Structure 1
Amino acid sequence: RFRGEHALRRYPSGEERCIACKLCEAVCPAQAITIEAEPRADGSRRTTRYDIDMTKCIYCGFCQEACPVDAIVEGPNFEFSTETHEELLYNKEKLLNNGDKWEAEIAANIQADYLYR
């Protein structure tokens, strides 16, 4: 159940889970999520901008409660301190990289804890 660094997940096919529904942006207490979306070249409802200000985030885990597709998660990583402030303003590429790096552990934790949810 630990809430550490955030990540954006994918389906086993590699497709992004996020459908740009902005429920996480709505529920975020700290207004730390910024989302902008448009139809993709194949007509999918997908995000073009997904930002999380990790200096504004209060690590409350409401975004992964409010996500209907398990896209945004708060992963197990907690050792991600940086040397400049700007490095803590994640964007979609950074969050997808986090998801790709931590997917195994994220999947294992969600499998372990999804029956309590």
Structure 2
Amino acid sequence: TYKFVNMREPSMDMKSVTDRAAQTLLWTELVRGLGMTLSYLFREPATINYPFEKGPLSPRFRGEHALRRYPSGEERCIACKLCEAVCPAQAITIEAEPRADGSRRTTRYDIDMTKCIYCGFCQEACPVDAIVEGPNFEFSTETHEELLYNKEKLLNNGDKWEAEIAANIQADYLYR
């Protein structure tokens, strides 16, 4: 149940003492370690050639948030605002009004990525699969204002990444 690390008495056999002194004087263990690093030298390096080569990723990856649309072209978001509630960082700000047609369409869907923790609770909460974190992890900006994403920005992100987002959802919806 318990193992004794260390706790090993040294044998005082003259041969054993001789080998121990040989290790001390001839620096055997240091040579052993040196050989280990030399072996590491002749291995194949594990560096990928960024950005020409990208690291492995799974379909469940969570990244840039994106607002999706139905195949007809109507925004899936029906302004339930439960994604706003579930958001543990209070990053989503949703304001909705009855559209000219009469449906629940948000007039404001603002998420500050600078406050979002990329948890993924929003996509798990949405009952129409509207807000789904996309696959894009490389969206660094130079100004803080850019991080704060408007509803228009989210819609454009959805339109840009829709193919991949839909493919990933199709590849993962069964697990969810």
TM exceeding 0.5: yes
2:175 and 2:115 mapped to 1: Cα distance? 28
Per the TM alignment, residue 105 of structure 1 is displaced from its structure 2 partner at its CA by: 0.2
1:23 and 1:65 mapped to 2: Cα distance? 10
Unaligned runs of 5+ in 2: 1-59
**1:107 alignment partner, SS class:** helix
1:64 and 1:41 mapped to 2: Cα distance? 27
2:103 and 2:127 mapped to 1: Cα distance? 17
Larger strand percent: 1
Cα-Cα RMSD: 0.3
1:28-67 matched pairs, under 5 angstroms: 28-67=87-126
Who wins on radius of gyration, i.e. which is larger? Answer: 2
Q: Output the TM-score relative to the length of structure 2.
A: 0.66
Q: Percent sequence identity over matched residues? A: 100
1:97 and 1:8 mapped to 2: Cα distance? 8
Unaligned runs of 5+ in 1: none
Per-residue CA deviation, residues 3-47 of structure 1 (Å, 9 max, x unaligned), is 000000000000000000001000000000000000000101110
2:81 and 2:70 mapped to 1: Cα distance? 19
Following TM superposition, the consecutive aligned residue runs of length 4 or more in structure 1 with deviations greater than 4 angstroms are none
**2:85 alignment partner, SS class:** helix
2:79 to 20, 28, 33: 20
Per-residue CA deviation, residues 63-103 of structure 1 (Å, 9 max, x unaligned), is 00000000000000000000000000001000000000000
Per the TM alignment, residue 108 of structure 1 is displaced from its structure 2 partner at its CA by: 0.2
Q: Output the TM-score relative to the length of structure 1.
A: 0.99
Per-residue CA deviation, residues 46-71 of structure 1 (Å, 9 max, x unaligned), is 10000001000000000000000000
User: What is the aligned length?
Assistant: 117
